[PDB]
């Protein structure tokens with residue numbers, strides 16, 4: 299049988315909060331079969347646990363935030379995406395503050411950490427969620443769809459009205475049977491804009507954003523293009539966010555995702571919509 303995975307080892311990393319702008323302490327730990335990815339706030343007494351589930355998703359304004367009463371964790375999408383990309387079913391994620399360290403603003407640091415800690419196979423079948431029929435959500439001009447597909451494919455399109463895109467719709471599509479998540483999706487950074495950042499810093503927000511975690515754009519052009527790692531990088535980060543959002547299902551996905559100018563709100567809306575639709579999906583394990 300294809301088996302569940304966790305971490306061979308504990309691993310500790312340090313970085314800065316995307317809004318606080320100050321050091322935050324992160325530990326990845328092995329976890330038992332059928333745990334899922336569980337976040338815990340070790341800076342509080344008692345320690346508070348937030349399972350990474352569709353139901354526990356909060357505000358979704360700029361990042362995917364999980365919530366439990368007054369306890370929250372901001373910016374979970376990049377690390378969940380790394381978890382989803384390397385097939386990590388079970389892990390504990392300890393945090394000394396309210397957010398995941400931003401690191402370089404992509405999944406690459408998390409992918410690296412998970413790999414260094416080692417992948418540990420567990421004596422239980424990997425549970426996959428197969429899309430049986432089409433599910434879609436819409437909010438104005440924004441749309442997100444699930445489609446039956448035998449494999450894992452993700453597509454994203456966005457007409458972003460900024461000169462750096464030369465009037466062109468931005469589109470990217472990744473079938474993960476024939477393309478590598480780590481090599482071609484995991485290192486993607488988003489586009490920061492001096493107008494958005496300029497305001498946010500001056501409104502006491504995103505004190506962590508810089509050229510270290512985003513591609514800074516000035517309402518005309520990318521400011522130093524030395525930052526780029528990919529062609530069509532901005533849609534690719536949309537694909538990266540989408541895989542982190544989709545993993546709040548708690549299981550790997552057999553099927554197809556299509557994003558039309560979507561993000562955190564609509565991705566979670568699509569997830570809750572699918573879960574509600576019992577004839578839309580099923581759970582399956584495989585032989586190897």
Ligand SMILES: N[C@H](CC(=O)O)C(=O)Nc1cccc(OC(F)(F)F)c1
Nearest residue numbers: 360403488490504507508511512539
């Ligand atoms: N997942 C979101 C992307 C989204 O919701 O489109 C994201 O990565 N945001 C993000 C990442 C790094 C820095 C940042 O602040 C900045 F503003 F300073 F750049 C924002």
Ligand SMILES: [Zn+2]
Nearest residue numbers: 375488535539
């Ligand atoms: Zn992101």
